[PDB]
């Protein structure tokens, strides 16, 4: 269907339902992690065609970075679901690794057979979607800076943690140059067109009561006249 | 550093009329206007230059004289000038016979000339008209003198061709703070500009060119908004 | 010196009227389509009553032609009527101020396809054909008055005009209607006051600003 519209009879209920899905579910399994990842990919589709923004999605990005590199004092304010699943200094970061590789049911069934390569693949796929969504949404959005600030903190922390990837610092440079280009003017929204002076229209050019008035005036005229004539007769 | 008024929502300033005699405002008058009602038998008609020539000759005046179109376009352009949408001016018609017609800034003129003429004749007879609300009278009629009907602290200037050119923006911006402005504008088609002399303090020019009355009104009005930051 | 479309070099003003209601009819002689001169006729051809405002056109023309910059000689007047006819007005016309004479002159123009004075040295009202840039001068900046378009200040716009850059304005002669008409032609849209205007008052204020800049 046509998703770019503001409201669609069935697309928007799907959006709120899948937002529910993004939000309330607990994150204990890499199955659910990849489930959120593909949920993100499909919202990214919906918004490369519709061009809006999702606070739940940016929250989910934050949460996913934190659950991947949970392995703590930096952000104790996140309430993750899994502390056990963490990636030590064992990543190969070889470019020939697995891509986003959508093998949807296949990935869902083989997820419990979880290699660090699969963890890296889902991580990279998610943050590629994150890069694309950033470059299509947030630099346009005004609050871009404070929107991405937790993302910048996570990315810098993960750089310090690993400093062996490339695409993290790639996104770092992208967002840094973007915020350098931006200006972030203070708000001036409340400004209104003065209301003018009200205007109006002028006026210009009951039959029962009308005929009553005319006949009564006639009668009064006649009574005066007959007075005067009888009086002259008498004199 | 300095807060804002408790409200800032848009709210229209109240209409200005002859009862308020304090706030600085703009007073435009159309003078010497050719406007009167005759009878033909069975009905009353306003004079117009183009259409009533046998009886215009019978009365003896000039076709070139008895023209109220000039009044119509002048009145329309004042009433729909931006300054009224800011709500700061009102107008006074000085009839050729001597009547004063004060035009409230809440009216909407009928734009076609026949409708306008109907309004003028109805006004000349009944002396007033009411609106859709009909809760306040729109077109009122008042006595000599205009000076008795003007804001207390004002100026007395008539826009005459012979008078030296002065830039309206300049002169208005020089005008003092509580100094309201009346301008006596000769609507009459062509002739002398020596009628309001006893009222006025000076004659003023805005160009080395002659002007149409409505255009002169537009220019002076324009300078007024340019001074008053609208 | 009188300006014309043949000279396309000097800096100047061009004023364009949009879809002006200039329509003719015959009853047994001719007549203008006046929304108030007749209503059953309007409903007879079924077209809307509230489109015929030859008055509106008339005072727009009166104000513009009587503006000082006119006989100061710095502009030309073009009108693209509702029916797709371009009307050229030179700076040398003493238009009758009367609307009835205006209507008679307009209908005889519509059926003569030209106006020449009794002097007859050169025409007066030129009935010519679309497009319009065929008669715009070379370096003309095209701007339409749009109510929702941001407000601008006429002087500053004139100084930001180039030295030889002529300037062309597009004003809608129609009371009701959206400003889509000359988007192909216009370079850009501007607003003039924060309270929406009359076409008459808009063109008047704009030409006064023009005179203010060009030291008239």
């Amino acid at each position: 269907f046509s998703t770019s519209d503001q409201y669609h009879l069935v697309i928007t209920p799907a959006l709120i339902l899948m937002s529910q899905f993004l939000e309330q579910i607990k994150f204990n399994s890499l199955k659910r992690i990849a489930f959120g990842a593909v949920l993100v990919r499909i919202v990214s589709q919906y918004q490369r065609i519709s061009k809006r923004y999702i606070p739940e999605v940016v929250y989910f990005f934050q949460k996913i970075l934190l659950t991947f590199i949970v392995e703590p004092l930096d952000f104790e304010n996140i309430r993750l679901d899994s502390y056990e699943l963490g990636l030590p200094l064992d990543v190969d970061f070889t470019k020939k690794r697995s891509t986003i590789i959508p093998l949807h049911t296949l990935s869902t069934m083989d997820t419990e057979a979880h290699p660090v390569d699969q963890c890296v693949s889902v991580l990279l796929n998610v943050m590629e979607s994150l890069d694309a969504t950033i470059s299509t949404v947030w630099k346009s959005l005004p609050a871009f800076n404070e929107i991405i600030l937790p993302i910048q903190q996570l990315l810098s922390a993960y750089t310090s943690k690993y400093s062996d990837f490339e695409k993290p610092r790639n996104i770092l440079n992208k967002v840094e140059k973007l915020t350098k280009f931006t200006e972030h003017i203070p708000l001036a929204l409340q400004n209104h067109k003065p209301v003018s002076i009200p205007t109006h229209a002028p006026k210009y050019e009951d039959r029962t009561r009308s005929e009553i008035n005319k006949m009564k005036a006639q009668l009064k005229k006649e009574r005066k006249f007959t007075m005067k004539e009888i009086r002259k007769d008498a004199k | 550093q300095k807060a804002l008024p408790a409200s800032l929502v848009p709210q229209a300033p109240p209409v200005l009329t002859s009862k308020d005699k304090i706030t600085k405002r703009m007073i435009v008058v159309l003078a010497m206007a050719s406007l009167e009602t005759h009878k033909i038998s069975d009905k009353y008609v306003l004079l117009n230059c183009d259409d009533h020539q046998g009886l215009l000759k019978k009365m003896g005046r000039d076709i070139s004289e008895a023209r109220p179109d000039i009044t119509h376009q002048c009145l329309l352009t004042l009433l729909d000038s931006p300054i009224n949408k800011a709500g700061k001016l009102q107008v006074y018609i000085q009839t050729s016979r001597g009547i004063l017609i004060e035009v409230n800034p809440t009216v909407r003129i009928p734009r076609t000339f026949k409708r306008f003429s109907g309004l003028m004749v109805q006004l000349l007879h009944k002396l007033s008209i009411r609106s859709v609300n009909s809760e306040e009278k729109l077109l009122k009629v008042i006595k000599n003198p205009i000076t008795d009907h003007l804001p207390t602290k004002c100026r007395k200037v008539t826009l005459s061709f012979d008078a030296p050119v002065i830039r309206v923006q300049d002169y208005i911006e020089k005008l003092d703070d509580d100094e309201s402005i009346c301008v006596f504008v000769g609507a009459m088609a062509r002739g002398k500009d020596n009628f309001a002399d006893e009222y006025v303090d000076e004659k003023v020019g805005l160009s080395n060119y002659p002007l149409s009355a409505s255009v002169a009104c537009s220019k002076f009005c324009h300078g007024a908004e340019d001074a008053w930051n609208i | 010196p009188v300006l014309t479309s043949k000279d396309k070099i000097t800096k100047r003003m061009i004023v364009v009227l949009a879809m002006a209601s200039l329509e003719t009819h015959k009853i047994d002689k001719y007549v203008l389509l006046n929304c108030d001169d007749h209503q059953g006729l309007l409903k007879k051809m079924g077209r809307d009553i509230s489109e015929a405002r030859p008055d509106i056109t008339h005072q727009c023309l009166l104000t513009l032609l009587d503006s000082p910059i006119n006989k100061a000689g710095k502009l030309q007047v073009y009108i693209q009527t509702s029916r797709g006819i371009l009307i050229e007005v030179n700076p040398t016309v003493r238009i009758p101020r009367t609307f009835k004479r205006f209507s008679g002159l307009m209908v005889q123009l519509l059926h003569k396809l030209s106006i020449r004075s009794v002097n007859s040295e050169e025409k007066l009202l030129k009935v010519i054909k679309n497009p319009i840039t065929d008669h715009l001068p070379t370096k003309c900046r095209k701007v339409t008055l749009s109510f929702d378009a941001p407000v601008i200040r006429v002087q500053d716009y004139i100084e930001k005009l180039d030295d030889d850059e002529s300037i062309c304005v597009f004003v809608g002669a129609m009371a009701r209607g959206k400003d889509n008409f000359a988007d192909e032609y216009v370079d850009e849209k501007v607003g003039l006051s924060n309270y929406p205007l009359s076409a008459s008052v808009a063109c008047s204020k704009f030409c006064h600003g023009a005179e203010d800049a060009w030291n008239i």
Binding site: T199, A201 | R108, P110, T112 | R53, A175, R176, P196, L197
Partner: peptide, 10 residues
């Protein structure tokens, strides 16, 4: 409610 639209009729 009224802006550059003339008047109604009867």
């Amino acid at each position: 409610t009224d802006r550059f639209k003339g008047d109604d009729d009867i």
